[PDB]
């Protein structure tokens, strides 16, 4: 059972956590106390962007999981505008208990509010499990997930 | 010959016919005189977000390519801010002359200029042949892009 809520200053050390000790992550985060302000410049502007969120699933205090989210308006689709969900990441000591599905489902019933025709999001082939998760919420792998990194 | 600029009101009606031109777009489109009021009201919409921007290709007033290129910022990577492409197109009375190529390195540039750290952009398994062209441009393949329509 989780609460399910965007994300506040008071959550982001504990998100930073869980994104450093990602399995692919913690090659490419910095956890540290105090956290690096290149979080803290990042957390501000997706803040200012009402149509840029980051969502936490809750147990209490205790974060449990998160993603980000980001609606944006496109030509394609007759003018649709779509949702991108980003690093959908769940707590290493909560895994199979279903977290991953409701933060997911609830980002979607968040899209469909804000009036988005599609859903889309990419996800690493180096995670088994992850191309599964996706197929079992109804999302289809039409399409090949490129990166280039400067 | 191609120029490439940020598209105007103008080059509207161009895009959409390409847009519904398009192997795999002309399924979801719906190009008719005058365009259906949610292009319309895509474009307006998309010319007034600074970090979601419309490329074209010109050949004079003729629009001969396209693509659609949005600056955010995430919690990942330290704070990374991404350039994703979306929908690079080429009329298809231009192919094979380097537009799609022009576009994109265009796009890449332009990511750099917004102090991006990755572009990304998803790529529809059946066009054979992008795959091979974005590898070749420097983009690896490594993530499955998933999409869910309502």
Redesign the interface.
Known sequence: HVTIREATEGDLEQ??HM?ADDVL?RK???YEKPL?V??????K??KK?KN?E?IVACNGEEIVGML?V?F??????????RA?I??VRTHSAARGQGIGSQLVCWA?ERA?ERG???????????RPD??RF?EQ??????????????
């Open positions: 998100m930073v994104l992550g490419r985060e910095r690096p290149s979080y803290v410049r990042a957390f502007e997706i962007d840029n980051l980000q980001t944006t308006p496109y030509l394609t689709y007759q003018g649709s505008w991108t980003e690093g979607i469909k988005c025709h599609l859903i889309q999001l990419t996800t690493d082939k180096q992850a191309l996706y919420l109804g999302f289809k792998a039409s399409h090949e997930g490129l990166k280039m990194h400067f």
